[PDB]
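Hi Prof. W.,

I finally got the Isoform 2 of Ectonucleotide pyrophosphatase/phosphodiesterase family member 2 prediction working! I wasn't sure whether to trim anything, so I left the full sequence exactly as given:
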Amino acid sequence: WTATSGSCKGRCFELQEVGPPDCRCDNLCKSYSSCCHDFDELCLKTARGWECTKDRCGEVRNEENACHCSEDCLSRGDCCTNYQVVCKGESHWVDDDCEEIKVPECPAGFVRPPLIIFSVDGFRASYMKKGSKVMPNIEKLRSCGTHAPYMRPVYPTKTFPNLYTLATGLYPESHGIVGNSMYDPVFDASFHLRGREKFNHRWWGGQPLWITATKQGVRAGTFFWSVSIPHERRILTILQWLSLPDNERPSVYAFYSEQPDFSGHKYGPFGPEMTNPLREIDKTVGQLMDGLKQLRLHRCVNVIFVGDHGMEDVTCDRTEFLSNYLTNVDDITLVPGTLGRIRAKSINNSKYDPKTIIAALTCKKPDQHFKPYMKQHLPKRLHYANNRRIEDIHLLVDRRWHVARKPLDVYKKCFFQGDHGFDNKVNSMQTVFVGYGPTFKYRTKVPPFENIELYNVMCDLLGLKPAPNNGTHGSLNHLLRTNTFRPTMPDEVSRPNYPGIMYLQSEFDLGCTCDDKVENKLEELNKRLHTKGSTKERHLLYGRPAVLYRTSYDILYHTDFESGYSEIFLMPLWTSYTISKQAEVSSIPEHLTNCVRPDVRVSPGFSQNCLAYKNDKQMSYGFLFPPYLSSSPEAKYDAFLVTNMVPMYPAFKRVWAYFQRVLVKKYASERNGVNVISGPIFDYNYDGLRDTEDEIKQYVEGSSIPVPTHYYSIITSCLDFTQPADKCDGPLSVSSFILPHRPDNDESCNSSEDESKWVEELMKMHTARVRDIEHLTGLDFYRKTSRSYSEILTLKTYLHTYESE
Ligand SMILES: *[C@@H]1O[C@H](CO)[C@@H](O[C@@H]2O[C@H](CO)[C@@H](O[C@@H]3O[C@H](CO[C@H]4O[C@H](CO)[C@@H](O)[C@H](O[C@H]5O[C@H](CO)[C@@H](O)[C@H](O)[C@@H]5O[C@H]5O[C@H](CO)[C@@H](O)[C@H](O)[C@@H]5O)[C@@H]4O)[C@@H](O)[C@H](O[C@H]4O[C@H](CO)[C@@H](O)[C@H](O)[C@@H]4O[C@H]4O[C@H](CO)[C@@H](O)[C@H](O)[C@@H]4O)[C@@H]3O)[C@H](O)[C@H]2NC(C)=O)[C@H](O)[C@H]1NC(C)=O
Ligand SMILES: C[C@@]12CN(C(=O)OCc3ccc(OC(F)(F)F)cc3)C[C@H]1CN(C(=O)c1ccc(S(N)(=O)=O)cc1)C2
Ligand SMILES: [Ca+2]
Ligand SMILES: [Cl-]
Ligand SMILES: [K+]
Ligand code: NA
Ligand SMILES: [Zn+2]
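And this is what came out:
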């Protein structure tokens, strides 16, 4: 109940909200049915429209007008945005040359440059180029400020998860808004676009920018706008707020546009009907910038022009129906559309089986346009699993497609030509970033980056300390003229041991054999030096990774590779080796096929054993440094050390062997040498974070050898490929992956074919940032380069996406 009989007189778009049943005048009262009787009359004035004309100039103030052209309007802060243009002979902001904004040029009483976030729904990255002719204001922001060619959204590439990621710096899994539609089994409540449940506070986790500002004494404009409040009125409201007294004026503001998304759904991303919505957004930007110029704020305010996701061509006829795969279709609830999420319709049905659902959805049709996954098997780059609101069974839908339960769902609930929500690597899903203002750089292009990074930067722009988030603070320093955040590298927590020869061969009873009994004083000083770390500068190019947690581990040197070996997990945490362009691939000699050798530097008690693998009928083994890339026949023996062995399912060994035998050489050939760091990952609770030993759900049978959930590799070389990877003078180039360690290749529908037809495709799908691997391993890479730390942070956030131009 709201007693709607108070008045909005003097309270229009009030900043602090009052509690029912007192009536509200804020930009959200509409969505609550709580506005005072006179809200429309007083607060949503429309008379005479949005622009001054010649004859209105110096008029008598008429309080009924939407905006004003009277003499007192500037000090009232409520002129139409074009007032000075029409009446004072001023130019529009867009017609002025751009001039570097070296320092904030602000009115007296401004303590910090204000931030305005101008967010546009569905603004696809290529609109910047393709719509450039009709967006002169936006284009001027873009070429005069700092811009990225695109910004990567989070998955799913829907509006709510992305705007709340912008606001918080968090993955949807951590902020809790994991879709536009959700069921929370703990609440037993449902969240939808339409309706009232979404207003309940328990959906919204983390700490959004407006709360971070408020807690630290920075005032915020109210971020959210009711749909019926037109764009012009939103702009005028922001501009009025900017004219408040110092003690009352907010420092941060948000504007939101429903366009071009709204039209994109109806007409497709590049429908001829899309030009008009683009023109109209540009006109709004024009109105804001002219209004700021009137208030002498246009060289004072930092403006962020940011999208939430792109838009793809999607039509009704490109729908897959679960009723073409499942017999039991009525026993399931599907969250449908550009992603699929499946749960049981009733939790009293113990006949429902996720294993048989997944099997019925796996590679059933030659050109099938979705792929089913247990959520924990989704590519780790999506960070889409660690939330009770995310159903165990997920469908990754191909771009341009929908999934639905039954055909009836599509025609009894073609309308649309556009949609979004797909994998956030997809080009059509990319969106925009432009920063313009005293604190951003002048005419600067920056590489693409992920929207989870912006919260930190908006905190930097406002002098706020960010709440803990998923950005990497400092990785976007290159966007900023000033207010950079200068991080220190994390301190190493565990220092390694450097073991020498401590054990005789006969102390090991591991059930391992090797055909290696062959008899030289020239080559004896030589092998001694290699085991002491003589070739280490060749194979460890960026220093050793730092171990950021408490553990017991050994550095192991070899001719061809260096490893950090975990006494706790009985395998390396990381193995580092360099493959030059000239290096040669050899095969494993016949006599060495099943060779595993005790490591005399490492205790039997801290070693794997061959028996466990013999006994374990499911589990086989592979090596982290590949025996194929050994520098010499004698060096090859090192590759067969028990300390280089890791557990692998035979199905995964097909993937791993092709990567190591074919792909490492291919990359070294193309990139002019590569440095490789590989290792295991244990993420049994799929929280994207390194497991402790007590979290491991699976061991090699009869042993304490834990089974990794994933294997990573980080592949680094010189950005200037004219320089070899091991003699690189400037910036680095990286690509990485986190491959799921699976007992089958069900994920790859073409796996019964030759590895050359499917393995690289799988690896591409599981592309990762070095940062993702850091979270999953507790390691910190690139500790010793000649590059600045912020540059290294940017590198660690890079994701190689494998999308064309
Ligand atoms: C991305 O960045 C984020 C932010 O940095 C990272 O997430 C953080 O990770 C931390 C490590 O997992 C985690 O720390 C834990 O916090 C527990 C306190 O939780 C509340 O308080 C915080 C602080 O304000 C709050 O943010 C939390 O918010 C969550 O929950 C609410 C409501 O439930 C949601 O609205 C919100 O969306 C958010 O949910 C998300 O996080 C939770 C986990 O907290 C998930 O379950 C959800 O799926 C969702 O993703 C909370 O309201 C604290 O209690 C924990 O302490 C345990 O572990 C420590 C180890 O130090 C141990 O000493 C303690 O004894 C304790 O164990 C006890 O509890 C166990 C479970 O009940 C039990 O087994 C034991 O026996 C003990 O009883 C822990 O310190 C932090 O909360 C989140 N923060 C956020 C915002 O998500 C994230 O890791 C990053 N991702 C990547 C890939 O890097
Ligand atoms: C609720 C809302 C009004 N809103 C608002 O006024 O937002 C301000 C804001 C700005 C920035 C921000 O980010 C930060 F902090 F970084 F600046 C946070 C909030 C958002 C709109 C979504 N909404 C929809 O109707 C809607 C429309 C389309 C779709 S879909 N089909 O997925 O495309 C889904 C939902 C109505
Ligand atoms: Ca984990
Ligand atoms: Cl959704
Ligand atoms: K076996
Ligand atoms: Na297969
Ligand atoms: Zn949309």
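Residues 505-797 form a domain with the Extracellular Endonuclease; Chain A fold (CATH 3.40.570.10). Does that look reasonable to you?

Thanks,
D.
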